[PDB]
Amino acid sequence: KLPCRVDGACDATIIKMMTDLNKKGIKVASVGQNYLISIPASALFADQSPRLNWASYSLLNEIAAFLKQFRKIAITVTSYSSKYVSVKRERALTLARSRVVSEYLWSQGVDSRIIFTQGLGSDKPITSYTLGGDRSPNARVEITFRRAV
Amino acid sequence: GIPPSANDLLLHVLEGVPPPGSRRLVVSGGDARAWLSNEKMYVRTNLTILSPGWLASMTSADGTHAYEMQKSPVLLVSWHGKVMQLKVEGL
Amino acid sequence: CFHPPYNNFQPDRRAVKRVGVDTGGGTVGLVASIYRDSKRKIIRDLQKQDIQYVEYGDTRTLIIPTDKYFMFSSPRLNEICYPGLNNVIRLLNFYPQSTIYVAGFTDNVGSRSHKRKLSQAQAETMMTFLWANGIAAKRLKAEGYGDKNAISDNAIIHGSAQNRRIEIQWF
Amino acid sequence: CFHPPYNNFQPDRRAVKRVGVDTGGGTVGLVASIYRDSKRKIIRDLQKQDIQYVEYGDTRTLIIPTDKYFMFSSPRLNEICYPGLNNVIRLLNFYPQSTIYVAGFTDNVGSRSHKRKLSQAQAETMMTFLWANGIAAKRLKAEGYGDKNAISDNAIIHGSAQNRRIEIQWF
Amino acid sequence: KFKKPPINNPSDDATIKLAEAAVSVSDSMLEMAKVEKVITPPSKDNTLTIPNAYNLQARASVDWSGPIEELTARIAKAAHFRFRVLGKSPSVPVLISISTKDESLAEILRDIDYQAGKKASIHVYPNSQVVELRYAKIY
Amino acid sequence: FKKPPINNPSDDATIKLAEAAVSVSDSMLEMAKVEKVITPPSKDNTLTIPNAYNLQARASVDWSGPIEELTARIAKAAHFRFRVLGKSPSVPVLISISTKDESLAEILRDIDYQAGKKASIHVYPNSQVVELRYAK
Amino acid sequence: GVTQINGVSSRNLQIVLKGDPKVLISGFVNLRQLDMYGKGTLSLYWIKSDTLTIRAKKAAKIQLAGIVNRLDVELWDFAQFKGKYLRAQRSFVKTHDKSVAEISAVNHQSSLATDASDIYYYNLSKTRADFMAFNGSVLDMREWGQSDLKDFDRYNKQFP
Amino acid sequence: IIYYIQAVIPGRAWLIGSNGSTLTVREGSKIPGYGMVKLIDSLQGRILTSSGQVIKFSQ
């Protein structure tokens, strides 16, 4: 009569969508009990504007379906971009991008308590090759959480 | 008419030793223990009891709670900001 | 052949033995050598052992468990697990220009000074083993943290077991 | 083709795609185009979605439900229901000289200032969506009323649901 | 064909009865709040006690139904501030219930401070980067 | 393709229920704004951090008893002098400090907050002394 | 040519430019319309108008400050409108390719950016409505450290 | 009486009063009821006076 597992969750399904996201190009990493999802900005937004494409909602649905498989308390969404005009414009752009991404994620049914959003601009790059625009590898959105129990 | 201070059996409940002469109850859905001695439950858990109401309460040094309350087959608790239920059997 | 205690700190001539025994083909031995000397085969062998590799951007990180690669509650290196250490040296040989950081982490059991001293001793031992295989001393730095920034929960058994580790980072 | 988010506010070339796909007849494609570009077909399409059209004398009125064409308790426009908005623009393109009045109405639940502010915000959002598609700013005016002059009873569920609306009148 | 625009999903009479109760509860609260505001006009705002600064403008959406201390510690840790507690915590716990969407951490702290009432208070010192929770001098 | 919210009020009774809940929450927030009374930070009667070099050392205190003994031990650990001005009552002032890693100045601030109107703690750093002053 | 005028008090003014002027006017001007097709720079110090219609075609620099009841701005390409410190109750702004507008709307704001254009606001209006077509963008561009900063309401929360 | 700022520029500001009378204020000038102006802020709508109060925008 008691439940036998977390409802709507399967380890084989978790492995399947992890492999599928890694083949598509969305970076999924797990160290200990911490989980990281890294998405390039070109696969979500337009050329340096906080407007989502219409075709990125399928990828956002896949990310939400991956996120429904775990139990968690807080999620963090952080945005990074590249240098275009000044620092105020890129910080505002990253904050708007994180706001829109977390708005759609909260609209979908993730069972979290708190979602934090920040945009850091271009303060923390991961690659010294900074020749591209939104095609650069260091223009991205990062989703971090910790699996609870 | 000074009211009584507390029940000193909650110290043994805090340590985890059941009261003498009591019987065990089965708790499902969370990390909690319960005993029944004199038609009252004694509950040892580190969660927060929300709905049914308790009569006496003690707290340990590491954050464990001990409650004295009347019998009920259900408990409403808050885990990490989320409200859920615990099932009590064997009453 | 190969000496099991670290091959006397000599560069192992692994390929010539296989291409000399695969003749009684030379092209088949060369194909086997160029397959087994690849970086992905070294990563997959380290994956068969209990050592984790993480690459993100231009930074690479190796995670090594002290519970299997050290003797218990000591800074001594466990000599039974020498293929993992040899594969670590083989993987680190592919980047001859980067700087190396090694860090030690333990769980929450014990005293603060004991945790700091044990982590520092294990970090010094791993840094010395890296130094003795050819890596220069100016490219190395070791640090031991306690239970400062853990990656799992210390209130559960498996999560506390996952927290005792050695981290190797390079650019 | 067609971009689902408002086609980048461009006039859609609907006829040439149909007469280019119905060739492998040109006359059959022209007949289909002149049928589907008619005013009555647009009115019946707006009847297939939940938008009501009332013509009486020389004044025309469109009734649009906020419960389906707006997100809940927000002045945000629901992007899923874009064919109804595109058909509204297509119907309003037939009268390039008239003036437009848009009004917002809610039910009786809430405070008076809250109802007035929500109606005003929804009216401004609908007027801005009309303005961004080509209609000049001097032909537009938006006003938000509360529960002032309702069309159904607010003491019943369906009648209270019928009262939350956007009214578009033109001459 | 004759039609009228709002055609939604079919409704349940239990939800109908709950809505009929909730409307009367809502306008009773509206009348009582109006009378209370007319009798007692407030004169001070908690902007002075809780000011904003940089990296308090990161945003959050929260649905929390538990005690105040863990949520305040999580907000402070996200805002990169130190956390301080003053006073003795009461035996009956101080319970809060927050359900918001996409607002700033200063506004979150102000709503938590207003919902705490006479039991606890929130102070923010931005020069030392300290979020402080103090309990009331009662019991 | 964009999806609707799963817990969306697509029902004509659930819409009314949810907007009634929103109005109730807004009215409760207004009532809380009316009833809450605050103090300005200029006249807040709480001891500030005396930011001397000897008072930034960490400490680990577990104590539940009189204020004078703990304050004397804190002054000895901070290498200050300690003096008392006033008269001890029949019922002593009881505080409770349980911290693992906290500065001595913050411990003194928490002691002064928990003492209330009965006693106050003053710190003089030029002539390094801690004064415990009772209320007449 | 350059022009520096200190003090104009007129109830009506209409300015149209066709070449490359560098003109600044001080005083009190009830402006009504403005069209630029050349390479002009114009700055007025104080205005008190009722309805302004601004059209910028090729490369224009306009700097206004004052009180305007209703403002309409059309930028076509390579045009910069610095309508900061010009508080408008009603604003309608349309920007086409590679043009920049910086507005200060107060009550009602309606903005459209078509393609690789930038619109910036500096005040939180009571009603905001922004639209993006190809690559344009509308940004908040506020301080984040001001002690009296205002948050979004139920009636202003629009997600780009 | 009380004053509110109407428009602001680097260098000077435009003020409106309760009676509807306009005023133009410099960095160094005297206005009635407030005293001496010591600072004019352009990024934020603040005019600091010698009496210890700030003229801001209307609400």
Side-chain angles (χ1 to χ4, degrees), chain C residues 85-132:
Chain C
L85 306 155
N86 295 336
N87 276 343
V88 159
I89 300 298
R90 268 196 271 277
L91 181 70
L92 269 179
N93 267 341
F94 271 104
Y95 304 92
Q97 309 287 348
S98 54
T99 73
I100 318 295
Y101 297 95
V102 287
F105 300 94
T106 58
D107 66 19
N108 68 314
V109 182
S111 163
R112 186 193 326 240
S113 52
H114 157 75
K115 287 180 272 213
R116 174 188 51 89
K117 282 191 247 195
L118 188 54
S119 301
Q120 177 81 306
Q122 281 165 327
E124 292 313 281
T125 301
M126 185 64 72
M127 183 278 288
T128 295
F129 181 73
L130 287 191
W131 164 83

Coordinates of all heavy atoms in Angstrom, one line a residue, chain C residues 85-132:
Chain C
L85 N 47.7 4.8 -10.5 CA 48.7 5.9 -10.4 C 49.5 6.0 -11.7 O 49.8 7.1 -12.1 CB 49.6 5.6 -9.2 CG 48.9 5.4 -7.9 CD1 49.8 4.6 -6.9 CD2 48.5 6.8 -7.2
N86 N 49.9 4.8 -12.3 CA 50.6 4.8 -13.6 C 49.7 5.4 -14.7 O 50.3 6.2 -15.5 CB 51.0 3.4 -13.9 CG 52.1 2.9 -12.9 OD1 52.8 3.6 -12.3 ND2 52.2 1.6 -12.9
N87 N 48.4 5.2 -14.7 CA 47.6 5.8 -15.7 C 47.4 7.3 -15.4 O 47.2 8.0 -16.4 CB 46.2 5.1 -15.7 CG 46.2 3.8 -16.6 OD1 47.1 3.7 -17.4 ND2 45.2 3.0 -16.4
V88 N 47.4 7.7 -14.2 CA 47.4 9.1 -13.8 C 48.6 9.8 -14.4 O 48.5 10.9 -15.0 CB 47.2 9.3 -12.3 CG1 47.7 10.7 -11.9 CG2 45.8 9.1 -11.9
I89 N 49.8 9.2 -14.2 CA 51.0 9.8 -14.8 C 51.0 9.8 -16.3 O 51.4 10.8 -16.9 CB 52.3 9.0 -14.3 CG1 52.4 9.1 -12.7 CG2 53.6 9.5 -14.9 CD1 52.6 10.5 -12.2
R90 N 50.4 8.7 -16.9 CA 50.3 8.7 -18.4 C 49.4 9.7 -18.9 O 49.6 10.3 -20.0 CB 49.8 7.3 -18.8 CG 50.9 6.3 -19.1 CD 50.4 5.1 -19.9 NE 50.0 4.0 -19.0 CZ 50.7 3.1 -18.4 NH1 52.0 3.1 -18.6 NH2 50.2 2.2 -17.6
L91 N 48.3 10.0 -18.2 CA 47.3 11.0 -18.6 C 48.0 12.4 -18.4 O 47.8 13.3 -19.3 CB 46.0 10.9 -17.9 CG 44.9 12.0 -18.2 CD1 44.4 11.7 -19.6 CD2 43.8 11.9 -17.2
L92 N 48.7 12.6 -17.3 CA 49.3 13.9 -17.1 C 50.5 14.2 -18.0 O 50.9 15.4 -18.1 CB 49.7 14.1 -15.6 CG 48.6 14.6 -14.7 CD1 49.2 14.7 -13.2 CD2 48.2 16.0 -15.1
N93 N 51.1 13.2 -18.6 CA 52.2 13.4 -19.5 C 51.7 14.1 -20.8 O 52.6 14.6 -21.5 CB 52.8 12.0 -19.9 CG 54.0 11.7 -19.0 OD1 54.5 12.6 -18.3 ND2 54.3 10.4 -18.9
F94 N 50.4 14.1 -21.1 CA 50.0 14.7 -22.4 C 49.9 16.3 -22.3 O 49.7 16.9 -23.3 CB 48.6 14.2 -22.7 CG 48.6 13.0 -23.5 CD1 48.3 11.7 -23.0 CD2 48.9 13.0 -24.9 CE1 48.3 10.6 -23.8 CE2 48.9 11.9 -25.7 CZ 48.6 10.7 -25.1
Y95 N 50.1 16.9 -21.1 CA 50.0 18.3 -21.0 C 51.3 18.8 -20.3 O 51.4 19.0 -19.1 CB 48.8 18.7 -20.2 CG 47.5 18.2 -20.7 CD1 47.0 17.0 -20.3 CD2 46.8 19.0 -21.7 CE1 45.8 16.5 -20.9 CE2 45.6 18.5 -22.2 CZ 45.1 17.3 -21.8 OH 43.9 16.9 -22.3
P96 N 52.4 19.0 -21.1 CA 53.7 19.4 -20.5 C 53.9 20.8 -20.2 O 55.0 21.2 -19.9 CB 54.7 18.9 -21.6 CG 53.9 19.1 -22.9 CD 52.5 18.9 -22.6
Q97 N 52.9 21.7 -20.3 CA 53.1 23.1 -20.1 C 52.2 23.7 -19.0 O 52.4 24.9 -18.6 CB 52.8 23.9 -21.4 CG 53.6 23.4 -22.6 CD 55.1 23.7 -22.6 OE1 55.5 24.5 -21.8 NE2 55.8 23.0 -23.5
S98 N 51.2 23.0 -18.5 CA 50.2 23.5 -17.6 C 50.7 23.4 -16.1 O 51.6 22.5 -15.8 CB 48.9 22.8 -17.7 OG 49.0 21.4 -17.6
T99 N 50.1 24.2 -15.2 CA 50.4 24.1 -13.8 C 49.4 23.2 -13.1 O 48.3 23.0 -13.6 CB 50.3 25.5 -13.2 OG1 49.0 25.9 -13.1 CG2 51.2 26.5 -14.0
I100 N 49.8 22.5 -12.1 CA 49.0 21.5 -11.4 C 48.7 22.0 -10.0 O 49.6 22.5 -9.3 CB 49.8 20.2 -11.3 CG1 50.5 19.9 -12.6 CG2 48.9 19.0 -10.9 CD1 49.6 19.6 -13.8
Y101 N 47.4 21.8 -9.6 CA 47.0 22.0 -8.2 C 46.4 20.7 -7.7 O 45.6 20.1 -8.4 CB 45.9 23.1 -8.1 CG 46.4 24.5 -8.6 CD1 46.2 24.9 -9.9 CD2 47.0 25.3 -7.7 CE1 46.6 26.2 -10.3 CE2 47.5 26.6 -8.1 CZ 47.2 27.0 -9.4 OH 47.7 28.3 -9.8
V102 N 46.8 20.3 -6.5 CA 46.3 19.1 -5.8 C 45.8 19.5 -4.5 O 46.4 20.3 -3.7 CB 47.4 18.0 -5.7 CG1 47.6 17.4 -7.1 CG2 48.7 18.6 -5.2
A103 N 44.6 19.0 -4.1 CA 43.9 19.4 -2.9 C 43.4 18.1 -2.2 O 43.0 17.2 -2.9 CB 42.7 20.4 -3.2
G104 N 43.3 18.1 -0.9 CA 42.9 17.0 -0.1 C 41.7 17.4 0.7 O 41.6 18.4 1.3
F105 N 40.7 16.4 0.7 CA 39.4 16.6 1.5 C 39.1 15.4 2.3 O 39.3 14.3 1.8 CB 38.3 17.0 0.5 CG 38.5 18.2 -0.3 CD1 39.1 18.1 -1.6 CD2 38.2 19.4 0.2 CE1 39.3 19.2 -2.3 CE2 38.4 20.6 -0.6 CZ 38.9 20.5 -1.8
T106 N 38.6 15.6 3.5 CA 38.1 14.5 4.4 C 36.6 14.8 4.7 O 36.0 15.8 4.3 CB 39.0 14.4 5.6 OG1 39.0 15.7 6.3 CG2 40.4 14.1 5.3
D107 N 36.1 13.9 5.6 CA 34.7 14.0 6.1 C 34.7 14.8 7.4 O 35.7 15.4 7.8 CB 34.1 12.6 6.2 CG 34.7 11.6 7.2 OD1 35.5 12.0 8.1 OD2 34.5 10.4 7.0
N108 N 33.6 14.8 8.1 CA 33.4 15.6 9.3 C 33.8 14.9 10.6 O 33.7 15.5 11.7 CB 31.9 16.0 9.4 CG 31.0 14.9 9.7 OD1 31.1 13.8 9.0 ND2 30.1 15.0 10.6
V109 N 34.3 13.7 10.5 CA 34.6 12.9 11.8 C 36.0 13.3 12.2 O 37.0 13.2 11.5 CB 34.5 11.4 11.5 CG1 34.8 10.6 12.8 CG2 33.1 11.0 11.0
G110 N 36.1 13.7 13.5 CA 37.4 14.0 14.1 C 37.4 15.5 14.6 O 36.4 16.2 14.6
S111 N 38.6 15.9 14.8 CA 38.9 17.3 15.2 C 39.4 18.1 14.0 O 39.8 17.5 13.0 CB 39.9 17.3 16.3 OG 40.5 18.6 16.5
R112 N 39.3 19.4 14.1 CA 39.6 20.3 13.0 C 41.1 20.3 12.6 O 41.4 20.2 11.4 CB 39.2 21.7 13.4 CG 39.3 22.7 12.3 CD 39.2 24.2 12.8 NE 38.2 24.2 13.9 CZ 37.1 25.0 13.9 NH1 36.8 25.7 12.9 NH2 36.4 25.0 15.0
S113 N 42.0 20.3 13.6 CA 43.4 20.3 13.4 C 43.8 18.9 12.8 O 44.7 18.8 12.0 CB 44.2 20.6 14.7 OG 43.7 19.8 15.7
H114 N 43.2 17.8 13.3 CA 43.4 16.5 12.8 C 43.0 16.4 11.3 O 43.8 15.8 10.5 CB 42.7 15.4 13.6 CG 42.4 14.2 12.9 ND1 43.4 13.2 12.7 CD2 41.3 13.6 12.4 CE1 42.9 12.2 12.1 NE2 41.6 12.4 11.9
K115 N 41.8 16.9 11.0 CA 41.4 16.9 9.6 C 42.3 17.7 8.7 O 42.7 17.2 7.6 CB 40.0 17.4 9.5 CG 38.9 16.5 10.0 CD 37.5 17.1 9.9 CE 37.2 18.0 11.1 NZ 35.7 17.9 11.4
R116 N 42.7 18.9 9.1 CA 43.6 19.7 8.4 C 45.0 19.1 8.2 O 45.5 19.1 7.0 CB 43.8 21.1 9.0 CG 44.8 22.0 8.4 CD 45.0 23.3 9.2 NE 45.3 22.9 10.6 CZ 46.5 22.7 11.1 NH1 47.6 22.8 10.3 NH2 46.6 22.4 12.4
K117 N 45.5 18.5 9.2 CA 46.8 17.8 9.1 C 46.8 16.6 8.2 O 47.7 16.3 7.5 CB 47.3 17.5 10.5 CG 47.9 18.7 11.3 CD 48.6 18.3 12.5 CE 47.9 18.8 13.8 NZ 48.8 18.7 15.0
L118 N 45.7 15.8 8.3 CA 45.6 14.6 7.5 C 45.5 14.9 6.0 O 46.1 14.3 5.2 CB 44.4 13.7 8.0 CG 44.3 12.3 7.3 CD1 45.6 11.5 7.5 CD2 43.1 11.6 8.0
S119 N 44.6 16.0 5.7 CA 44.5 16.4 4.4 C 45.7 17.0 3.8 O 46.1 16.7 2.6 CB 43.3 17.4 4.3 OG 42.1 16.9 4.7
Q120 N 46.5 17.8 4.6 CA 47.7 18.4 4.2 C 48.8 17.3 3.9 O 49.5 17.4 2.9 CB 48.2 19.4 5.2 CG 49.6 20.0 4.9 CD 49.5 21.2 3.9 OE1 49.0 21.0 2.8 NE2 50.0 22.3 4.3
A121 N 48.8 16.3 4.8 CA 49.8 15.2 4.6 C 49.5 14.4 3.3 O 50.4 14.0 2.6 CB 49.8 14.3 5.8
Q122 N 48.2 14.1 3.1 CA 47.9 13.3 1.9 C 48.1 14.2 0.6 O 48.6 13.6 -0.4 CB 46.4 12.9 1.9 CG 46.2 11.7 2.8 CD 44.7 11.5 3.2 OE1 43.9 12.5 3.3 NE2 44.3 10.2 3.3
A123 N 47.9 15.5 0.7 CA 48.2 16.3 -0.5 C 49.7 16.4 -0.7 O 50.1 16.4 -1.9 CB 47.6 17.7 -0.2
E124 N 50.5 16.5 0.3 CA 52.0 16.5 0.1 C 52.5 15.2 -0.4 O 53.4 15.2 -1.3 CB 52.7 16.8 1.5 CG 52.5 18.2 2.1 CD 52.8 19.3 1.1 OE1 53.9 19.6 0.8 OE2 51.8 19.9 0.7
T125 N 51.9 14.1 0.0 CA 52.3 12.8 -0.5 C 51.9 12.6 -2.0 O 52.8 12.2 -2.8 CB 51.6 11.6 0.3 OG1 52.0 11.8 1.7 CG2 52.0 10.3 -0.2
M126 N 50.7 13.1 -2.4 CA 50.4 13.0 -3.8 C 51.2 14.0 -4.7 O 51.6 13.6 -5.8 CB 48.9 13.3 -4.0 CG 48.4 13.2 -5.4 SD 48.5 11.5 -6.0 CE 47.2 10.7 -5.1
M127 N 51.5 15.1 -4.1 CA 52.4 16.1 -4.8 C 53.8 15.6 -5.0 O 54.4 15.8 -6.0 CB 52.3 17.5 -4.1 CG 53.1 18.6 -4.8 SD 54.9 18.7 -4.5 CE 54.9 19.3 -2.8
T128 N 54.3 14.9 -4.0 CA 55.6 14.3 -4.1 C 55.7 13.2 -5.1 O 56.6 13.0 -5.8 CB 56.1 13.8 -2.7 OG1 56.2 14.9 -1.8 CG2 57.4 13.1 -2.7
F129 N 54.6 12.3 -5.1 CA 54.5 11.3 -6.1 C 54.4 11.9 -7.5 O 55.0 11.3 -8.5 CB 53.4 10.3 -5.8 CG 53.3 9.2 -6.8 CD1 54.1 8.2 -6.8 CD2 52.3 9.2 -7.8 CE1 54.0 7.1 -7.7 CE2 52.1 8.2 -8.7 CZ 53.0 7.1 -8.6
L130 N 53.8 13.0 -7.7 CA 53.7 13.7 -9.0 C 55.1 14.2 -9.3 O 55.5 14.2 -10.5 CB 52.7 14.8 -9.0 CG 51.2 14.3 -9.1 CD1 50.3 15.5 -9.4 CD2 51.0 13.2 -10.1
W131 N 55.8 14.8 -8.3 CA 57.1 15.4 -8.6 C 58.2 14.4 -8.9 O 59.1 14.7 -9.8 CB 57.5 16.2 -7.3 CG 59.0 16.6 -7.3 CD1 59.6 17.7 -7.9 CD2 60.1 15.9 -6.6 NE1 60.9 17.7 -7.6 CE2 61.2 16.6 -6.8 CE3 60.1 14.8 -5.8 CZ2 62.5 16.2 -6.3 CZ3 61.3 14.4 -5.3 CH2 62.5 15.1 -5.5
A132 N 58.1 13.2 -8.3 CA 59.2 12.2 -8.5 C 59.1 11.5 -9.9 O 60.1 10.8 -10.2 CB 59.1 11.1 -7.4

